[PDB]
Tab-separated table of C-alpha atoms in Angstrom:
chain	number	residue	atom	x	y	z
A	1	UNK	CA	124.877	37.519	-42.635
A	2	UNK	CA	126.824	38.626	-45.392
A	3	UNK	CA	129.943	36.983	-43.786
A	4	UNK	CA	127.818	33.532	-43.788
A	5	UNK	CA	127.860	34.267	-47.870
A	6	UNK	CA	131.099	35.649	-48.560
A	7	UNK	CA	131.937	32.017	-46.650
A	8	UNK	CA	130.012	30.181	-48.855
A	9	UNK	CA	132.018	31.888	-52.722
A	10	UNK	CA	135.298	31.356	-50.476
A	11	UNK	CA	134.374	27.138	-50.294
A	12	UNK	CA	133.080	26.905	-53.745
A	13	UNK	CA	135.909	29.121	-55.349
A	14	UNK	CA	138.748	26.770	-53.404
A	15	UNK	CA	136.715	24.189	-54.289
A	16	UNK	CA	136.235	24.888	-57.961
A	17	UNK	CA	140.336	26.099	-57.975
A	18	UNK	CA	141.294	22.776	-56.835
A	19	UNK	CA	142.260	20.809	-59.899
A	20	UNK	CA	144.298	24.077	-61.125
A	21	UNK	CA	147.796	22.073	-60.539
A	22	UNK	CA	146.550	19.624	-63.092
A	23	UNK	CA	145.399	22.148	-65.505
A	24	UNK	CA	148.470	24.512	-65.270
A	25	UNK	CA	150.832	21.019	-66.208
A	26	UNK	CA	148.092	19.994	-68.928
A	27	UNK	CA	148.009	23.005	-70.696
A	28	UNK	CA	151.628	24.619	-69.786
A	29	UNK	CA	149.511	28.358	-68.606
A	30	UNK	CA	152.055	30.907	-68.110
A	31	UNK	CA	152.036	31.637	-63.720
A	32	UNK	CA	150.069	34.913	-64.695
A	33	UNK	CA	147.361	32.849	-64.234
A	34	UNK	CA	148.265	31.882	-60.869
A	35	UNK	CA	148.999	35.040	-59.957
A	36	UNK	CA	144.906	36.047	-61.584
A	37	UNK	CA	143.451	33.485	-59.353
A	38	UNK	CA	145.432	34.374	-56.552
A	39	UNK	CA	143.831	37.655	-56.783
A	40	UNK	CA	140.518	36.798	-58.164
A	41	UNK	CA	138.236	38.145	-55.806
A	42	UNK	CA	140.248	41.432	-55.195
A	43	UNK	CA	138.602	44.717	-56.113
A	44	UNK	CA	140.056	46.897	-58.494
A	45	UNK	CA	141.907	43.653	-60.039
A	46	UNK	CA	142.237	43.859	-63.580
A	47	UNK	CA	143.199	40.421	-65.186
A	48	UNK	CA	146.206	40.214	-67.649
A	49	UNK	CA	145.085	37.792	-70.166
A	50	UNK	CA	143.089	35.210	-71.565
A	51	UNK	CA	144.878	32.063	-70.652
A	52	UNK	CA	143.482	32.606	-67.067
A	53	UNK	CA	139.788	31.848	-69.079
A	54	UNK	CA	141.267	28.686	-70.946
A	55	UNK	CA	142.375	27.827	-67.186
A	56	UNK	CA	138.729	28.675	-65.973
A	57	UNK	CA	137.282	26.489	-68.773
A	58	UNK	CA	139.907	24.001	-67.537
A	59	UNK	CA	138.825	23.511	-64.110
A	60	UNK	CA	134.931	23.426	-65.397
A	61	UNK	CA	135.926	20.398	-67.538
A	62	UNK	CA	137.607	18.597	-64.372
A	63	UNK	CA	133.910	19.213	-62.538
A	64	UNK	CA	132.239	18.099	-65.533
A	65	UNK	CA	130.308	21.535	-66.064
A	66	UNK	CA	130.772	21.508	-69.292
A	67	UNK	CA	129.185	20.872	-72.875
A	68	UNK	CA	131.657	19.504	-76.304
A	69	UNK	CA	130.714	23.077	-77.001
A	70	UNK	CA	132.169	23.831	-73.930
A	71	UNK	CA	129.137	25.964	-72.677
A	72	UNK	CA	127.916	25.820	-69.455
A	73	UNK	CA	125.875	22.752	-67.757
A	74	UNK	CA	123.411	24.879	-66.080
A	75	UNK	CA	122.071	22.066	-63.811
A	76	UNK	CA	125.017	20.667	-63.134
A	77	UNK	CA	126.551	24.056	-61.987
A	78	UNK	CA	123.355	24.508	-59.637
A	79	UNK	CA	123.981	21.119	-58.373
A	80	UNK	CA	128.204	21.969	-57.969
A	81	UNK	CA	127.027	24.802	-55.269
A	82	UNK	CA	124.666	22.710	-53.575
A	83	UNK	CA	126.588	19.796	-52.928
A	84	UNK	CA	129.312	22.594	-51.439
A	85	UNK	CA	127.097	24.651	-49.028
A	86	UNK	CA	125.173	26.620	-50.815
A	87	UNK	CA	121.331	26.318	-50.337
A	88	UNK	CA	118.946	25.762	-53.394
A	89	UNK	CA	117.931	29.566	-53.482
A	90	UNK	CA	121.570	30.641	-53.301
A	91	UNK	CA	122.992	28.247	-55.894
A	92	UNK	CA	119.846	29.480	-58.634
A	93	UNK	CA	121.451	32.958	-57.700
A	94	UNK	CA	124.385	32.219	-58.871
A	95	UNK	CA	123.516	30.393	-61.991
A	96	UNK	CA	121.455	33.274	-62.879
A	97	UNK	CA	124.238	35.613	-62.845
A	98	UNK	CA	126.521	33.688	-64.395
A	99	UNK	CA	123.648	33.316	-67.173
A	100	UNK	CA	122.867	36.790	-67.123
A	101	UNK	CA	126.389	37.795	-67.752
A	102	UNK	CA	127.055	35.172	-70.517
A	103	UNK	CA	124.005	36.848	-72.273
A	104	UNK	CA	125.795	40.284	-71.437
A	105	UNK	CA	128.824	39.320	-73.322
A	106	UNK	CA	128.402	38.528	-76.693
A	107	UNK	CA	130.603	35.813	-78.403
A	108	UNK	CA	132.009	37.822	-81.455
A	109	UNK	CA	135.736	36.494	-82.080
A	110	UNK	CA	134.424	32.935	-81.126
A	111	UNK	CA	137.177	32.773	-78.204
A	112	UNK	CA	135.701	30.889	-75.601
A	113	UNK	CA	138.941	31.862	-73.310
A	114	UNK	CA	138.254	35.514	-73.928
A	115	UNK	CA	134.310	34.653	-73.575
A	116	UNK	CA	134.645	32.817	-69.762
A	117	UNK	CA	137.783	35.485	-68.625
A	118	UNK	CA	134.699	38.470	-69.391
A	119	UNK	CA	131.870	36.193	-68.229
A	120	UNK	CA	134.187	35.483	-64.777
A	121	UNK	CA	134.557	39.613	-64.696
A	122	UNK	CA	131.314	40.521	-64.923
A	123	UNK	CA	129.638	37.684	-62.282
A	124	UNK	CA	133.011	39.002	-60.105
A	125	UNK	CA	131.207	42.560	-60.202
A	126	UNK	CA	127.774	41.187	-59.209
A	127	UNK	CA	129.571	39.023	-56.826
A	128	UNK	CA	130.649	42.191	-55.329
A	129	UNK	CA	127.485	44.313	-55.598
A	130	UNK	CA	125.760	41.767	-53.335
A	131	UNK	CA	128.561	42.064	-51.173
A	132	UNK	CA	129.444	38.545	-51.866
A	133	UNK	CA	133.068	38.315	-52.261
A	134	UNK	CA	135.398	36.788	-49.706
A	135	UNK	CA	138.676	37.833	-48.417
């Protein structure tokens, strides 16, 4: 039932993109970013630039998933899946990778754009290894 799954990233990822209007007007994010989350979950897609991470930090600030350090509110992102579909098991999954991958790429230029745009590649490659990744 890895078309039950894929079903599951597809409903959080529309759900997590949904205050994107809001952040593209708040910020003023060039439409590359658009165009990055239009093909977010496309293999071989290589992202152009770091504004699409400022955009993901955006919409985790509209969801409240985020720390004044604007780190990740483990819990809360656990709690984000759930309350869209995913079951307990599956939402610890995914907080794990994202965890896992945060840990994998080490803040160095203290960029938190840069920092969430390679955090969001490398959880899109797990994403993918499980066979996760909707169409």
């Amino acid at each position: 039932g890895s078309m039950a799954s894929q079903d599951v990233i597809k409903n959080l990822s529309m759900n997590f993109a949904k205050p994107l209007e809001d952040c593209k007007k708040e910020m003023d994010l060039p439409d590359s970013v658009t165009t990055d989350f239009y093909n977010f979950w496309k293999e071989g897609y290589e992202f152009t630039n770091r504004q699409t991470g400022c955009a993901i930090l955006c919409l985790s600030s509209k969801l409240e998933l985020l720390d004044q350090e604007l780190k990740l509110h483990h819990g809360k992102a656990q709690e984000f899946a759930k309350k869209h579909g995913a079951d307990d098991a599956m939402a610890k999954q995914l907080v794990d990778l994202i965890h896992g991958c945060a840990q994998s790429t080490p803040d160095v230029a203290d960029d938190p754009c840069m920092k969430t745009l390679n955090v969001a590649k490398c959880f899109k490659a797990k994403i993918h290894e499980l066979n996760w990744a909707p169409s």
